[PDB]
Design an enzyme around this catalytic site. Structure first.
Site, PDB file in Angstrom:
ATOM      1  N   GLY A   1      50.923 -70.655  28.477  1.00 16.70           N
ATOM      2  CA  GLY A   1      49.516 -70.567  28.244  1.00 16.70           C
ATOM      3  C   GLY A   1      49.078 -71.499  27.222  1.00 16.70           C
ATOM      4  O   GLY A   1      49.910 -72.382  26.684  1.00 16.70           O
ATOM      5  N   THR A   2      47.635 -71.541  26.981  1.00 14.28           N
ATOM      6  CA  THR A   2      47.281 -72.507  25.987  1.00 14.28           C
ATOM      7  C   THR A   2      47.128 -71.990  24.724  1.00 14.28           C
ATOM      8  O   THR A   2      47.393 -70.611  24.515  1.00 14.28           O
ATOM      9  CB  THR A   2      45.351 -72.760  26.245  1.00 14.28           C
ATOM     10  N   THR A   3      47.028 -72.876  23.503  1.00 15.79           N
ATOM     11  CA  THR A   3      46.855 -72.614  22.104  1.00 15.79           C
ATOM     12  C   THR A   3      45.667 -71.642  21.879  1.00 15.79           C
ATOM     13  O   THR A   3      44.640 -71.920  22.540  1.00 15.79           O
ATOM     14  CB  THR A   3      46.897 -73.529  21.227  1.00 15.79           C
TER      15      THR A   3
ATOM     16  N   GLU B   1      41.924 -73.401  22.581  1.00 18.48           N
ATOM     17  CA  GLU B   1      42.025 -74.564  23.437  1.00 18.48           C
ATOM     18  C   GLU B   1      41.679 -74.396  24.668  1.00 18.48           C
ATOM     19  O   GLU B   1      42.348 -73.696  25.453  1.00 18.48           O
ATOM     20  CB  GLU B   1      43.503 -75.146  23.076  1.00 18.48           C
TER      21      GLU B   1
ATOM     22  N   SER C   1      45.812 -65.348  25.493  1.00 18.66           N
ATOM     23  CA  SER C   1      46.474 -66.289  26.016  1.00 18.66           C
ATOM     24  C   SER C   1      47.502 -65.636  27.143  1.00 18.66           C
ATOM     25  O   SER C   1      47.902 -64.641  26.943  1.00 18.66           O
ATOM     26  CB  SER C   1      47.209 -67.030  24.957  1.00 18.66           C
TER      27      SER C   1
END
Lengths: 52, 242, 240, 244, 250, 243, 241, 109, 233
Positions: free
Chosen positions: F29-31, F46, F74
């Site tokens: 997943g994304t930050t 993010e 996330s």
């Protein structure tokens, strides 16, 4: 042998649909004397999918 | 196990793929609908002279102006027909009005849909959608005369002409050419019997064919023996020119 | 209790259970019905071979469901008991709510709906039980002989065989009965039922039950001396 | 976890004969022999215990012959734990019918309902079925003595003689040659004890490995009397017949 | 959220006889030794009770528990299974018992209730059987002193002498000879301790050895002597000192 | 072998292997970062712009609980939404009983029970999401992270997603240089910096910076998004720093 | 095969789920030491060196169950939170029905019943934590009860849990048997703390600092941790000595 | 026995054309086959051909071979000097009894 | 392929993927192609009606939820019937109690929760259907894309069904064109005509097969077919 170069086409032949199996029955049946008016498609209908 | 939950690699339901083959074994049913009457003609299965051909039925009244034909698993299709009957009466109570063939078609598919796996929005007591297809025909003003073909898929298509059962494929090929807008009730009737002998394993008789209609005049009305015979007799005379 | 799916369709479009159910029927010992236009005549084989089994208190297959509706079977002997009770409550429920005894036609659909529910539910195995249902419709003397399949399908039949070796029995009914005109009298008709059963039974007079049900709730059972009387005639045909 | 794994006993068998029920008959034949001999004037009912351990107080503890009520006694062969539940269920059923109608329940009715419970388990119960056969020795006035046995199948069959437990065939064969239709209760007492000894590998089947009961109408003033015979009374009649 | 099981996990083996009953039993055999002698004027029940860790309190560990003030019980097998089964048995007896009778349950009765519960565990899907054997030792008017043995199979029988656990085979034989028709309360205890020494040798402090008798009635222990015709607790859990005393008179 | 497959059965090492499978989504997943600051907490996440079909400022993962707890997550996106709903349910129930906002410590405790419950069921799968949550309340600023396996701790700084490696290595040095903490305002600029180091990792697609905050002094202990001039300067200035 | 895999009694009768659970404790690597004071119950434990991401002052091992009972948990960090609920909830239960909080012995009995149940159903599994309930009961005086995943439990004079529990046992064995005292007979509770830390440092071989510590003291009608100021003040006395 | 005992490979189907499934003797079949066998057993002519068929249980012609052998086997034990009507009748009962004994009762439920 | 885990919903592979969702993405591509586009003041759906054969009549693929909202079905057809009846009830309830119309964002969210729930536990199929939800509300025009997974995402244009790539190519070029068109129905519909001709390769449109609907500021939900759509071509 299976690796590429050697073999450039691969094709699976399978038992055909009812319309083709009507056609395969048709050719053989024609060669013999029969009482005409025959429904080729009737005989093929009863038969499940089958070999020539 | 292979549940309703778990799909095939393509993404299809298992039961939908299997149910096609189930229907195929079933009894041939031929439907040609016109704006002069829906004519339903079906093959009656027979195994003995000893079977009594009056008792059995394959055209089944669901309502005063609603006729049906069934194919597939017959015993599952006997329940299907009982519940369809319930739905129709229940609508008649609520609006004081004869159900549109089209709405009735949807109400039946909603009831086949419901499993056994265990939902959280729905009641479970079956295991699967029924693996039976039905031809739901009937008359109402809005659409005129109608004929519907319901799939186990949870999909309904309206048809001009549809053949199900053993003879599905060969009957349909003729029905595309021969069906027309011009056809009337007497035209339609002769055509159905003609297709029926080619796909019937044995001979065509009035004692192994059963014809019915939906007309708006009579409602659902099953033809007596005598009419049926006479249209067979009439078809013979034309065949012997050849 | 159990409720998990067993109505999983084969890829050959059939419930597996329903197939197995058909297999079971055959094994149950034969039962035969041939209706006359003035009777229904019922024959069946019962266990009575075993010295030191008292037949009076050994249960009889042929079952009263109503005074004018009777029921016989081929199949699981365990599951029939359940079946018979279900029919008996339904039979009485009609007199309670709609009035008048079950119409025969109505009880045939009830019996069929039980089997059907077992296929709707994945939990419940269908009974492996076919039944012959015979009787007289209310206010009427018309004989009805009905037949079932364990799959939940019913149909009326002029003559029937279910159970062991239907092949030999079927071939006899196709030559010995013809549909155009039924046997004229009770006596002519009893003889045909008797002749047919002895084919796959082999003689006896002590082991086999024949039960004649006539209109207006008359159920009467043939004495062993009466059974033999028909055998004595037939021995002469076989000789000539 | 639980979805993956299965121990369904509710498959409709392909042989027409459920496999679990097959194995429960095996298990019955491990448990000792119980014999029902129906005579015109009674049912002579006798069952050997299968324990033989010396420290174990067998004397006190009846484990096979249980009196349900005045006219009905059951002999057990099979799983003793499973059996206990069905004894309480059978006791309460006869009492409830007696209360509603003021007549001791006909034998037929009681046996049928209990068989239908066993049936139910494999019908759609999900349960393993009870692996017990019971001989219900019963009386009612209308039908005389009546003798029925049950199966783990949930099927009952009437008889004039039956055997369950071990040596079903050995016992059945003797009774066929020796018992005649007309022998009375009196004969059947002598007959039962002797055939049991001859089937069993014991040199003399002791009184302390026996349980014996009779249900008879030859108890004066038109009455029905049962008596589960006490171990020492079995002993005197054991000596007469020369087993000891 | 319930397990999706809908069926009995317990199946008949294909040779007969439940898999799981056999599976449960092994535990009783593997577990540590217990013995009991039924006597005419009491019952001695005895078990080894080894320190788990010397630092562990060896007094709070118990294997004797009360069912009624008259009837006590000891087991061999799974320890956590026992604790729960006792709690269920207090309710099954007491409340229901008081409603249909209003007394303490006789021993015969109490033992039978326990047998059904063991069966229902096994039969019930999602619940695996209790694998413990308990000896329930008690008193009732009508049978004098009684000892029943309750097997995890849901079956009970009364015994003159019995043993379960590892040392059962050795113990039963020793006892068999020593058992008499007439027995002193004092002798039943001497004989019990003598055999118990052979089960595992050493550790004969009366602390690490748990001993109870279903001795004679006390209005003293009852805690009211104002009417002393009331039955006192028949059950007595002996002190360590008392055991120490028995070793000298053996 | 078989112990692994069977959900909620002890692995022969210890603890069901499915709980470990679920962790792996969270890395993919994304930050998402959570910074504890003097004034309050500053969240940044993010949001990848895969395409321009995407609607700017409008694919927020920022979901308010009560009114003073931001929540952002996330990993598996549907799983989060269910746990998000669960937080809501829990907050309201406290207000039924006790007529006042839930404290942040109490929220951290009560959310954690829900994860455990499903993971002692074989029938109901693990959560596939780490949740960063926190706000300012009466008892001050507080930052908690609920790991996928269910563990809550206080944090000076928190990170999840692909770029947590970049995020962590900065936050350690930033706390070493500033042990007296830093204002939430300055940390708006510094959140922006941190996310830029993590977009080295997620360099495949362009991105859009989204900050939200809940601060004691400046949002007045309510939670609202950061937008307009505050957000613009944060973008502008951070950029220069990272060149 | 199958039997072994899921919960149900193996052929041997072993419960594999339970055996694995015991390995599971050691995997957290947490070590504990608890002694009995004269009038206090001192339990001390390690805590793994803090991360700069975490807050070093936070704790999550100690949970105040009730005024009487404090609890320290050794084993799976996620499951410790799960267990903490059940102890407080049943603690409060006893206050309504029976009118006061559970004793130490009586709370152990209750958790053990619950543990047993969790093992039989498939869906439910035993809590993989080992729970150490500390209390001073009035009747028993200073008390420690150790309750296991199995549903097994027993009191202790002094207890140890973890991979290096082996070292602590040997130290306490030396401490308490030779003297011939069941518990420390020192009256002041402060000198029980002084001294339990001393035995920890000796036994595992590694010195403790404020950050690893965490001092739990339970007394009559109170469970308290020591303030950070006091933790540091015990350190000054420990070093001189 | 079957083509499934062999690795199947029988080439050209229409080159092996029709396949013949043997049913076992039925009631009418075994009359004729019986007639040969009873002519060997001395004086079994007395017992009418038809009634021999009737009294026994439906069985295959093979089992007639077993039965015919049973008659002579019993005549040997007896030291029945000449085979009689009584031997042939006794023979039926022992032969039928053998086949039932050999069968295993698994109980039709 | 089967393998992996999909008879069991709970259990996932090492990666974390559940096979069930993969199949459900494929299911979309097998059935009906439908394209959507929106300007700030209108929301457009363009659906290609389809049948099994010639004698069969064509069958709606946009099913009107409400005067202000709609959806179009492309993966499993029984699944869509379920969700639409469900969503009809939720708009009624929200309109009744709060006096405020069910805004398109929440509506996708309530919907995710239902699908997610069936996939969380044993029992219940994943809803395999991909729906494209339009709606016109106080805050202008919206178009959401309902994944089988239970993920909603705001987009300006999107394409679903097999060979969807072609349609997306066009829409991104004319992204800017389309949005700045506002107050114009004609203009929008004309672009969307062209978007779907990119998708279709060796396949024919027919005007009666082409079914187009708008909802916007001045327009409630309306369906146009035949002579009506002949205008926009």
């Amino acid at each position: 042998l299976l690796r590429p170069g050697r073999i450039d086409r691969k094709v699976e032949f399978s038992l055909p649909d009812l319309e083709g199996r009507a056609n395969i029955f048709r050719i053989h049946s024609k060669s013999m004397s029969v009482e005409r008016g025959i429904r080729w498609e009737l005989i093929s209908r009863l038969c499940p999918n089958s070999t020539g | 196990d292979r549940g309703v939950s778990t799909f095939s690699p393509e993404g299809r339901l298992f039961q939908v793929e299997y149910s096609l083959e189930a229907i195929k074994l079933g009894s041939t049913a031929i439907g040609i609908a016109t704006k002069e009457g829906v004519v339903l003609g079906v093959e009656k299965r027979a195994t003995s002279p000893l079977l009594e051909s009056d008792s059995i039925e394959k055209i089944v009244e669901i309502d005063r102006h609603i006729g049906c034909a069934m194919s597939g698993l017959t015993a599952d299709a006997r329940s299907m027909i009982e519940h369809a009957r319930t739905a129709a009466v229940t609508h008649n109570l609520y609006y004081d009005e004869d159900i549109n063939v089209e709405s009735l078609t949807q109400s039946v598919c909603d009831l086949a849909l419901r499993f056994g796996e265990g939902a959280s929005g729905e009641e479970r007591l079956m295991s699967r959608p029924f693996g039976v297809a039905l031809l739901i025909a009937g008359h109402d003003a809005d659409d005129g005369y109608q004929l519907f073909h319901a799939e186990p898929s949870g999909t309904f298509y309206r048809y001009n002409a549809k053949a199900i059962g053993s003879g599905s494929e060969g009957a349909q090929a003729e029905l595309l050419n021969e069906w027309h807008s011009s056809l009337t009730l007497k035209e339609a009737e002769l055509l159905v019997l003609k297709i029926l002998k080619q796909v019937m394993e044995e001979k065509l008789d009035e004692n192994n064919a059963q014809l019915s209609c939906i007309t708006k005049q009579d409602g659902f009305k099953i033809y007596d023996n005598e009419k049926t015979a006479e249209l067979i007799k009439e078809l013979k005379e034309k065949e012997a020119a050849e | 209790g159990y409720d998990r799916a067993l109505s999983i369709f084969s890829p050959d479009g059939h419930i597996f259970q329903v197939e197995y159910a058909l297999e079971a029927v055959k094994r149950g010992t034969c039962a035969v019905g041939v209706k006359g236009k003035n009777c229904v005549v019922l024959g069946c084989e019962r266990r009575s071979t075993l010295k030191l089994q008292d037949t009076r208190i050994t249960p009889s297959k042929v079952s009263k469901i109503d005074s004018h509706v009777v029921l016989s079977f081929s199949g699981l002997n365990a599951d029939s008991r359940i079946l018979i009770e279900k029919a008996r409550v339904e039979a009485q429920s009609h007199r309670l709510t709609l009035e008048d005894p079950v119409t025969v036609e109505y009880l045939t659909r009830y019996v069929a709906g039980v089997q059907q529910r077992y296929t709707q539910s994945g939990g419940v195995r269908p009974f492996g039980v076919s039944t012959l249902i015979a009787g007289f419709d209310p206010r009427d003397d018309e004989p009805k002989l009905y037949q079932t399949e364990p799959s939940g399908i019913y149909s009326s039949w002029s003559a029937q065989t279910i159970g062991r070796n239907s092949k030999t029995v079927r071939e006899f009914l196709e030559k010995n009965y013809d549909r155009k005109e039924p046997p004229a009298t009770v006596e002519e008709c009893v003889k045909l039922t008797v002749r047919s059963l002895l084919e796959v039974v082999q003689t006896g007079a002590k082991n086999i039950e024949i039960t004649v049900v006539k209109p207006d709730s008359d159920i009467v059972a043939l004495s062993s001396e009466e059974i033999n009387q028909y055998v004595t005639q037939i021995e002469q045909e076989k000789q000539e | 976890g639980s979805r993956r794994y299965d121990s369904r006993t509710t498959i409709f068998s392909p042989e027409g004969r459920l496999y679990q029920v097959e194995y429960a008959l095996e298990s019955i034949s491990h448990a000792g022999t119980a014999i029902g001999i129906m005579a015109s004037d009674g049912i002579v009912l006798a069952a050997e215990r299968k324990v033989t351990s010396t420290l174990l107080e067998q004397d006190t503890s009846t484990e096979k012959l249980y009196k349900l009520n005045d006219k009905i006694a059951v002999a057990v062969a099979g799983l003793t734990a499973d059996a206990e539940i069905l004894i309480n269920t059978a006791r309460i059923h006869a009492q409830n019918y007696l209360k509603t109608y003021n007549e001791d329940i006909p034998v037929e009715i009681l046996v049928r309902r209990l068989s239908d419970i066993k049936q139910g388990y494999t019908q759609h119960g999900g349960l393993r079925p009870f692996g017990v056969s019971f001989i219900y020795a019963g009386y009612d006035d209308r039908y005389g003595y009546q003798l029925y046995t049950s199966n783990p199948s949930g099927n009952y069959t009437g008889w004039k003689a039956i055997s369950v437990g071990a040596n079903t065939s050995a016992a059945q064969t003797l009774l066929q040659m020796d018992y005649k239709d007309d022998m009375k209760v009196d004969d059947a007492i002598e007959l039962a004890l002797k055939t049991l000894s001859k089937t069993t590998d014991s040199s003399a089947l002791t009184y302390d490995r026996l349980e014996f009961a009779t249900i008879r109408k030859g108890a004066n003033d038109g009455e029905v009397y049962q008596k589960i015979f006490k171990p020492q009374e079995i002993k005197d009649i054991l000596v007469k017949t020369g087993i000891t | 959220m319930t397990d999706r099981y809908s069926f009995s996990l317990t199946t008949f083996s294909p040779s007969g006889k439940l898999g799981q009953i056999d599976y449960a039993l092994t535990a009783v055999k593997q577990g540590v030794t217990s013995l009991g002698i039924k006597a005419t004027n009491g019952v001695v029940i005895a078990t080894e009770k080894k320190s788990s860790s010397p630092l562990a309190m060896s007094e709070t560990l118990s294997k004797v528990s009360l069912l009624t003030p008259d009837i006590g019980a000891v087991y061999s097998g799974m320890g956590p299974d026992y604790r729960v089964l006792v709690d269920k048995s207090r309710k099954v007896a007491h409340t229901s018992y008081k409603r249909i009778y209003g007394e303490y349950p006789p021993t015969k009765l109490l033992v039978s209730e326990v047998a059904k519960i063991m069966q229902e565990a096994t039969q019930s899907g999602g619940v695996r059987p209790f694998g413990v054997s308990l000896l329930i030792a008690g008193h009732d008017e009508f049978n004098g002193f009684s000892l029943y043995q309750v097997d995890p199979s849901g079956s009970y029988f009364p015994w003159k002498a019995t043993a379960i656990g590892k040392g059962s085979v050795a113990a039963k034989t020793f006892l068999e000879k020593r058992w008499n028709d007439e027995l002193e309360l004092e002798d039943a205890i001497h004989i019990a301790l003598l055999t118990l020494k052979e089960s595992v040798e050493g550790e004969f402090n009366g602390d690490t050895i748990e001993l109870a008798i279903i001795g004679d009635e006390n209005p003293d222990l009852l805690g009211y002597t104002g009417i002393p015709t009331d039955k006192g607790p028949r059950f007595r859990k002996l002190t360590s000192q008392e055991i120490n005393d028995r070793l000298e008179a053996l | 072998t078989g112990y692994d497959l069977s959900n909620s059965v002890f692995s022969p090492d210890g603890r069901n292997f499915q709980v470990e499978y679920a962790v792996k989504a969270v890395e993919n997943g994304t930050t998402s970062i959570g910074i504890k600051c003097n004034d309050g907490v500053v969240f940044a996440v993010e949001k990848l712009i895969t395409s321009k079909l995407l609607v700017p400022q409008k694919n927020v993962k920022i979901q308010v609980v009560d009114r003073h707890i931001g929540c952002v997550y996330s990993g598996l996106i549907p799983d989060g939404r269910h746990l998000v709903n669960r937080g809501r349910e829990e907050a309201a129930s406290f207000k039924k009983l006790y007529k006042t906002p839930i404290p942040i410590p109490a929220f951290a405790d009560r959310l954690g029970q829900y994860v455990q419950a499903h993971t002692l069921y074989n029938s109901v799968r693990p959560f596939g999401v780490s949740t960063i949550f926190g706000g300012v309340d009466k008892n001050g600023a507080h930052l908690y992270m609920l790991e996928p396996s269910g563990s809550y701790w206080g944090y000076k700084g928190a990170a999840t997603g692909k770029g947590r490696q970049s995020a962590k290595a900065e936050l350690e040095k930033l706390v070493d240089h500033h042990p007296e903490g830093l204002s939430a305002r300055e940390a708006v600029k510094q959140a922006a910096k941190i996310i830029y180091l993590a977009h080295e990792d997620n360099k495949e697609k362009d991105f859009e910076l989204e900050i939200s905050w809940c601060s004691l002094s400046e949002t007045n202990g309510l939670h609202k998004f950061v937008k307009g001039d505050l957000l613009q300067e944060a973008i502008d200035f951070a950029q220069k720093e990272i060149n | 095969g199958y039997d072994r895999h899921i919960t149900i009694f193996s052929p041997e009768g072993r419960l594999y789920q339970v055996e694995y659970a015991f390995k599971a404790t050691n995997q957290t690597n947490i070590n504990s030491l608890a002694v009995r004071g004269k009038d206090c119950t001192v339990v001390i434990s390690q805590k793994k060196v803090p991360d700069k991401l975490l807050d070093p002052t936070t704790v999550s091992y100690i949970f105040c169950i009730s005024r009487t009972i404090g609890m320290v948990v050794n084993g799976p960090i996620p499951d410790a939170r799960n267990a903490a609920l059940r102890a407080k909830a049943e603690a409060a239960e006893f206050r309504y029905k029976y009118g006061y909080d559970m004793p130490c012995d009586v709370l152990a009995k209750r958790m053990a019943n619950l543990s047993q149940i969790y093992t039989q159903r498939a869906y439910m599994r035993p809590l993989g934590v080992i729970l150490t309930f500390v209390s001073v009961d009035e009747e028993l005086g200073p008390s420690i009860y150790k309750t296991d995943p199995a549903g097994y439990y027993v009191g202790y004079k002094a207890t140890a849990t973890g991979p290096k529990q082996q070292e602590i046992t040997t130290n306490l064995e030396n401490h308490f048997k030779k003297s011939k005292i069941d518990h420390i007979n020192e009256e002041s509770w402060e000198k029980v703390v002084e001294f339990a830390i001393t035995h920890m440092i000796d036994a595992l071989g590694t010195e403790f600092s404020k950050n690893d510590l965490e001092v739990g003291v339970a007394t009559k009608d109170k469970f308290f941790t020591l303030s950070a100021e006091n933790i540091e003040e015990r350190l000054v006395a420990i070093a001189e000595q | 026995n079957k083509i499934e005992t062999l690795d199947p490979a029988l080439i050209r189907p229409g080159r092996i054309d029709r396949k013949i499934l043997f049913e076992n003797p039925d009631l009418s079949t075994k009359k004729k086959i019986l007639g040969i066998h009873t002519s060997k057993m001395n004086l079994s002519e007395d017992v009418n051909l038809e009634t021999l068929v009737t009294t026994k249980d439906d069985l295959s012609g093979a089992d007639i071979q077993a039965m015919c052998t049973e008659a002579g086997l019993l005549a040997l034990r007896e030291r029945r000097m000449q085979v009689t009507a009584e031997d042939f009748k006794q023979a039926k009962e022992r032969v039928m009894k053998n086949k039932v004994e050999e069968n295993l009762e698994g109980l039709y439920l | 392929f089967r393998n992996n885990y999909d008879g069991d919903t709970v259990t996932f592979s090492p990666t974390g993927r559940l096979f069930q969702v993969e199949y459900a993405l494929e299911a979309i591509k097998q059935g009906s192609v439908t394209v959507g586009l929106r300007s700030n003041t209108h929301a457009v759906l363009v659906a290609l009606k389809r049948n099994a054969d010639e004698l069969s009549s064509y069958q709606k693929k946009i099913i009107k939820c409400d005067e202000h909202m709609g959806l179009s079905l492309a993966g499993l057809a029984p699944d869509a019937r379920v969700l639409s009846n469900y969503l009809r009830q939720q708009c009624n309830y929200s309109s009744l109690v709060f006096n405020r119309k069910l805004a398109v964002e929440r509506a996708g969210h309530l919907l995710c929760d239902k699908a997610q729930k069936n996939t969380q536990s044993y029992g219940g199929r994943p809803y395999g259907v991909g729906l494209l939800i339009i709606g016109y509300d106080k805050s202008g025009a919206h178009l959401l894309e309902f994944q089988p997974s239970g993920n909603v995402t705001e987009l300006y244009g999107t394409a679903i069904g097999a060979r969807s790539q072609g349609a997306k190519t066009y829409l991104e070029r004319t992204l800017d064109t389309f949005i700045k068109i506002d107050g114009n129905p004609d203009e929008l519909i004309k672009a969307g005509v062209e978007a779907i001709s990119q998708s279709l390769r060796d396949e024919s449109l027919t005007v009666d097969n082409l079914s187009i609907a708008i909802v916007g500021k001045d327009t409630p939900f309306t369906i146009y077919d035949g002579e009506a759509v002949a205008k926009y071509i």
